[PDB]
Design a protein around this ligand. Structure first.
Ligand code: 1NJ
Ligand code: 1NJ
Ligand code: CA
Lengths: 254, 55
């Protein structure tokens, strides 16, 4: 996270840390005791699926305070429409091997209904993005969980307000822009998979997933997030399914 | 009704045949007698921050 602040311990209780052989991989969002939403691109380079760990209740990476809960990942579900090495359909649904225990430090974020997310949540201007990603473009990552408030843009406005690059990914209907074009604030590498959480009448909801962007806080650019509202039905159906051997599961989308 | 101001619902909104509207709540919540508000039924409902809720 670039230009954010430390999320006070317990204020981002749905934040997940994903680890591969103990090393920082990506973020994620807890949506119930068993399920975590992350970005499909986080898993493009995974060789041994058994080395993937999800950590809940984490705050400061340099210390353990006993509020952390570690789980093995029993399943990584990715839409059939996602192509490794590309940006579209950047979502993954993770099944934890054993449920996490809900506590003051471990709470799921609400996965909203599609209609409510499209008709109401899509019009809330500001939403929170969080993670232990790079604090700066080409910089060191954060030791304490960071959080940033970002405004959402309509795709037409994002394209109008953005600098043209060339070989730049298209912003699809499965994405949205959020952030600032002045070089001050953005989500960054290592934040991928983490929540873009929207407040509405006292409750927080999952609206986006940190997905991609031109560098980090690059002048003339905005962060790009997976538009979670497009995947509600896909996610709900899979959460009702029985697990299958072999961690990686490609599931038809729609 | 649901298209404008979330049909007055705190959470989920369902339009019906005619001028009828049903508000609904996520799991771990129940709809109050006002037919719009949602109150937690569990200790750890989704989307609420316990340390901030406990003040
Ligand atoms: C948090 O704990 C650690 C522990 C060790 C390292 C680390 C530092 C230097 C190096 C490294 O390449 N060192 C060489 C000498 O072997 C230098 C020439 C840079 C000194 C390797 C690693 C590693 O992760 O294996 C790091 C660390 O910063 N690693 C790291 C790995 C990959 C990327 C990337 N994909 N761009 C970015 C950063 N972090
Ligand atoms: C869309 O597909 C991919 C594929 C891979 C990456 C990626 C590449 C290297 C690294 C990286 O350097 N990782 C090291 C360890 O290897 C960290 C120490 C930062 C975790 C991280 C990521 C990531 O997933 O965030 C990314 C990628 O860098 N994502 C990304 C997300 C948000 C922004 C922004 N809002 N400005 C910018 C970039 N995207
Ligand atoms: Ca486990």
């Amino acid at each position: 996270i670039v230009g954010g602040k430390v999320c006070p311990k317990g204020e981002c209780p749905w934040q997940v840390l994903l680890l591969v052989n103990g090393a920082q991989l990506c973020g994620g969002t807890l949506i119930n005791t068993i399920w975590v939403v992350s970005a499909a691109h986080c898993f493009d380079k995974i060789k041994n699926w058994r080395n993937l760990i999800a950590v809940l209740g984490e705050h400061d990476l340099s210390e353990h305070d006993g509020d952390e809960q570690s789980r093995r990942v029993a399943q990584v579900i990715i839409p059939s429409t996602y192509v490794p090495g590309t940006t579209n359909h950047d979502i993954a649904l993770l099944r934890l091997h054993q449920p996490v225990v809900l506590t003051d430090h471990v709470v799921p974020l609400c996965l909203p209904e599609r209609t409510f997310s499209e008709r109401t949540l899509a019009f809330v201007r500001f939403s929170l993005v969080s993670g232990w990603g790079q604090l700066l473009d080409r910089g060191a990552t954060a030791l304490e969980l960071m959080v940033l408030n970002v405004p959402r843009l309509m795709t037409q406005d994002c394209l109008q307000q953005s600098r043209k690059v060339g070989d730049s990914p298209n912003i699809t209907e499965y994405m949205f822009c959020a952030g600032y074009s002045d070089g001050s604030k953005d989500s960054c590498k290592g934040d991928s998979g983490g929540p873009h959480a929207t407040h509405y009448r006292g409750t927080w909801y999952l609206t986006g997933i940190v997905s991609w962007g031109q560098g980090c806080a690059t002048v003339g650019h905005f962060g790009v997030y997976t538009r979670v509202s497009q995947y509600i039905e896909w996610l709900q159906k899979l959460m009702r399914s029985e697990p299958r051997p072999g961690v990686l599961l490609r599931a038809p989308f729609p | 009704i649901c298209v404008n101001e979330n049909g007055g619902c705190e959470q989920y909104c369902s339009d019906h045949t005619g001028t009828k509207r049903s508000c609904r709540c996520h799991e771990g919540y129940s709809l109050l007698a006002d037919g719009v508000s949602c109150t937690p039924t569990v200790e750890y409902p989704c989307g609420k921050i316990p340390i901030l809720e406990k003040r």
